[PDB]
Coordinates of C-alpha atoms in Angstrom, one line a residue:
Chain A
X5 CA 99.2 124.5 96.1
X6 CA 99.5 126.3 99.4
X7 CA 98.0 124.4 102.3
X8 CA 100.8 123.2 104.7
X9 CA 100.4 126.7 106.1
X10 CA 97.3 125.3 107.9
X11 CA 97.7 123.4 111.2
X12 CA 97.9 119.7 110.6
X13 CA 94.6 118.9 112.2
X14 CA 92.9 121.3 109.7
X15 CA 94.8 120.3 106.4
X16 CA 92.9 118.7 103.6
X17 CA 94.6 116.0 101.5
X18 CA 94.1 116.1 97.7
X19 CA 95.9 115.0 94.5
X20 CA 98.0 118.2 94.6
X21 CA 98.8 117.6 98.3
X22 CA 98.6 113.9 99.4
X23 CA 98.1 112.1 102.7
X24 CA 101.8 111.7 103.0
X25 CA 102.6 115.3 102.4
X26 CA 99.8 116.4 104.8
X27 CA 100.0 113.8 107.6
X28 CA 103.2 112.0 107.1
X29 CA 103.7 108.3 106.3
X30 CA 101.5 105.3 107.4
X31 CA 103.2 103.2 110.0
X32 CA 103.1 101.1 113.2
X33 CA 104.1 103.9 115.8
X34 CA 101.5 105.4 118.0
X35 CA 102.4 108.9 116.6
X36 CA 101.6 108.0 113.0
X37 CA 98.4 107.5 111.0
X38 CA 97.7 104.0 109.9
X39 CA 94.8 104.5 107.5
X40 CA 94.8 104.6 103.7
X41 CA 95.8 102.2 100.9
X42 CA 97.8 103.7 98.0
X43 CA 95.0 105.1 96.1
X44 CA 93.7 107.1 99.1
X45 CA 97.4 107.8 100.0
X46 CA 97.8 109.5 96.6
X47 CA 94.3 111.1 96.1
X48 CA 93.2 112.1 99.6
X49 CA 89.7 113.8 99.5
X50 CA 89.8 113.1 95.7
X51 CA 89.7 109.3 96.0
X52 CA 86.5 108.0 94.4
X53 CA 85.3 106.7 97.8
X54 CA 86.2 109.6 100.1
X55 CA 82.5 110.7 100.8
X56 CA 81.7 107.2 101.9
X57 CA 84.7 107.3 104.3
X58 CA 84.1 110.9 105.4
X59 CA 80.5 110.2 106.5
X60 CA 82.2 108.7 109.7
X61 CA 84.6 111.6 110.5
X62 CA 83.1 113.7 113.4
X63 CA 82.0 117.3 113.5
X64 CA 83.7 119.6 115.7
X65 CA 81.0 119.4 118.2
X66 CA 80.9 115.6 118.2
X67 CA 84.7 115.3 118.2
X68 CA 84.7 117.0 121.6
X69 CA 81.4 115.7 122.7
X70 CA 82.1 112.0 121.9
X71 CA 85.8 111.6 122.5
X72 CA 87.9 111.0 125.6
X73 CA 90.1 114.2 125.7
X74 CA 93.5 114.4 127.2
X75 CA 96.5 116.6 127.6
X76 CA 100.0 115.2 127.6
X77 CA 103.0 117.4 128.5
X78 CA 106.7 116.5 128.4
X79 CA 109.8 118.8 128.7
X80 CA 109.6 119.7 125.1
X81 CA 105.8 119.5 124.3
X82 CA 102.1 119.8 124.7
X83 CA 99.6 117.6 122.9
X84 CA 95.8 117.3 122.9
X85 CA 95.1 113.6 123.1
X86 CA 91.9 111.8 122.0
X87 CA 90.2 108.5 121.5
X88 CA 86.6 107.2 121.0
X89 CA 84.4 105.0 118.8
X90 CA 81.7 105.7 116.2
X91 CA 78.9 103.0 116.0
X92 CA 78.1 102.1 112.4
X93 CA 74.4 101.8 111.4
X94 CA 73.6 98.0 111.3
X95 CA 70.4 98.7 109.3
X96 CA 71.9 100.7 106.6
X97 CA 72.1 98.9 103.2
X98 CA 75.7 100.0 102.8
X99 CA 76.7 98.4 106.1
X100 CA 78.6 95.4 104.7
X101 CA 80.4 97.6 102.1
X102 CA 81.2 100.3 104.6
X103 CA 82.9 97.7 106.6
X104 CA 84.8 96.5 103.5
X105 CA 85.9 100.1 102.6
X106 CA 87.0 100.7 106.2
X107 CA 88.7 97.3 106.6
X108 CA 90.8 97.7 103.5
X109 CA 92.4 101.1 104.2
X110 CA 92.7 100.5 107.9
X111 CA 96.0 98.8 108.1
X112 CA 96.9 98.8 104.4
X113 CA 100.5 100.0 104.3
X114 CA 101.2 96.6 105.8
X115 CA 100.6 94.9 102.4
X116 CA 102.4 97.7 100.4
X117 CA 105.8 95.8 100.6
Chain B
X15 CA 59.0 116.2 118.4
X16 CA 61.8 118.1 120.3
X17 CA 64.3 119.0 117.4
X18 CA 65.3 117.5 114.0
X19 CA 68.8 117.2 115.2
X20 CA 68.8 113.7 116.4
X21 CA 68.0 112.0 113.1
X22 CA 71.6 113.1 112.1
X23 CA 74.2 110.5 112.9
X24 CA 75.8 111.0 116.3
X25 CA 79.2 111.8 114.8
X26 CA 77.7 114.6 112.7
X27 CA 75.5 116.1 115.4
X28 CA 76.3 119.7 116.5
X29 CA 75.1 120.6 120.0
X30 CA 73.6 124.2 120.4
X31 CA 71.6 125.9 123.2
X32 CA 68.6 124.4 121.5
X33 CA 70.1 120.8 121.6
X34 CA 72.9 120.7 124.1
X35 CA 75.9 118.4 124.6
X36 CA 74.0 116.0 126.9
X37 CA 71.2 115.7 124.4
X38 CA 73.5 115.0 121.4
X39 CA 76.2 113.0 123.1
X40 CA 74.9 111.7 126.5
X41 CA 76.1 112.6 129.9
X42 CA 79.9 113.1 130.5
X43 CA 81.4 110.5 132.8
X44 CA 84.2 108.1 133.9
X45 CA 83.4 105.3 131.2
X46 CA 85.4 104.7 128.0
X47 CA 82.2 104.9 126.0
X48 CA 81.4 108.3 127.2
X49 CA 82.8 111.8 126.6
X50 CA 84.6 113.6 129.4
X51 CA 85.0 117.0 127.9
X52 CA 82.9 120.0 129.0
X53 CA 82.1 122.2 131.9
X54 CA 78.5 123.0 132.8
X55 CA 78.4 126.0 130.4
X56 CA 79.9 124.1 127.4
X57 CA 77.6 121.2 128.0
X58 CA 74.7 123.6 128.1
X59 CA 75.6 125.9 125.3
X60 CA 77.6 123.6 123.1
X61 CA 78.3 125.5 120.0
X62 CA 76.9 128.7 121.4
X63 CA 79.6 128.6 124.1
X64 CA 81.6 131.8 124.2
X65 CA 85.0 130.2 123.5
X66 CA 83.8 127.5 121.2
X67 CA 85.8 128.8 118.3
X68 CA 89.0 128.6 120.4
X69 CA 88.2 124.9 121.3
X70 CA 87.0 124.0 117.8
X71 CA 90.4 125.0 116.1
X72 CA 91.7 121.8 117.5
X73 CA 89.1 119.6 115.8
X74 CA 90.4 117.8 112.7
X75 CA 88.8 118.0 109.3
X76 CA 87.4 114.8 107.9
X77 CA 90.7 114.4 106.0
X78 CA 93.0 114.8 109.1
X79 CA 90.8 112.6 111.3
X80 CA 91.7 109.8 108.8
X81 CA 95.3 110.7 108.0
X82 CA 96.4 111.7 111.4
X83 CA 94.6 109.1 113.5
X84 CA 95.0 105.5 114.4
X85 CA 91.9 103.8 113.1
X86 CA 90.4 100.5 114.0
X87 CA 87.3 98.3 114.0
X88 CA 85.8 96.6 117.1
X89 CA 82.9 94.1 117.0
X90 CA 80.8 93.9 120.2
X91 CA 77.1 92.8 121.0
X92 CA 76.3 96.6 120.7
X93 CA 77.3 96.6 117.0
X94 CA 80.3 97.3 114.8
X95 CA 82.3 100.4 115.8
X96 CA 85.0 102.4 114.0
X97 CA 87.6 103.1 116.7
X98 CA 90.0 106.2 116.7
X99 CA 92.8 107.7 118.7
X100 CA 95.4 110.4 118.3
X101 CA 97.3 113.4 119.6
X102 CA 97.2 116.8 118.2
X103 CA 100.4 118.8 118.9
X104 CA 99.7 122.3 120.2
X105 CA 101.9 125.1 118.9
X106 CA 104.1 126.3 121.8
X107 CA 104.8 129.4 119.6
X108 CA 101.2 130.6 119.1
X109 CA 101.2 133.6 121.6
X110 CA 97.7 132.2 122.4
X111 CA 99.4 129.0 123.7
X112 CA 99.1 129.6 127.4
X113 CA 95.4 130.5 126.9
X114 CA 94.9 127.4 124.7
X115 CA 96.0 125.0 127.4
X116 CA 94.1 126.4 130.4
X117 CA 90.9 126.5 128.2
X118 CA 91.3 122.9 127.4
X119 CA 92.0 122.3 131.1
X120 CA 88.8 124.1 132.2
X121 CA 87.0 121.4 130.3
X122 CA 89.0 118.1 130.8
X123 CA 87.0 116.1 133.3
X124 CA 85.1 119.1 134.5
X125 CA 82.0 116.9 135.3
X126 CA 84.1 115.5 138.3
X127 CA 83.8 118.7 140.4
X128 CA 80.3 119.9 139.3
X129 CA 78.8 121.0 142.6

């Protein structure tokens, strides 16, 4: 399933190519991703609740329009840095549940062991 | 009225000449709640900007935003937010490297020197 050929930030995680394979292990360091319980870990964009998650990932235009964009450069490297926040819709019916979905993958690896 | 572009959620909006970066995402500025990316032309043309495709290659897919990033949840008076932060390593060995950095530079904090 060729797909690592893509730049990290463009990869799509699936059954055939999981989160861990695409984006490395979940973990405490500032350079690692912290999101995803085991099911999402294994299934990526196949998980049965992906679309509910993905409704919050930004478009390309919003990624660069909403975020605080930075450049970090060290002797061996150059990184685009970014941070921001997405407000959830307090009126949406799904609100509670969206919070429960989100809160369960957020720091999940921490209750793997 | 205006467009039909603002009933989309912020994070899914896509600024064009017809509905520009200021309209979709608010003015650039110093604050942590605001974006800081874009020179006058990017802000005004958004996705019709000449070198959009060369900026946009650094935007993550939905899947990457969630597997690469450090995700959180903050609860203000505003509402509940999904927080996010990260670093996308640029490839030193793309011969477009040089050009990728200065292009990201043109736009980092560009609002500060706007005449």
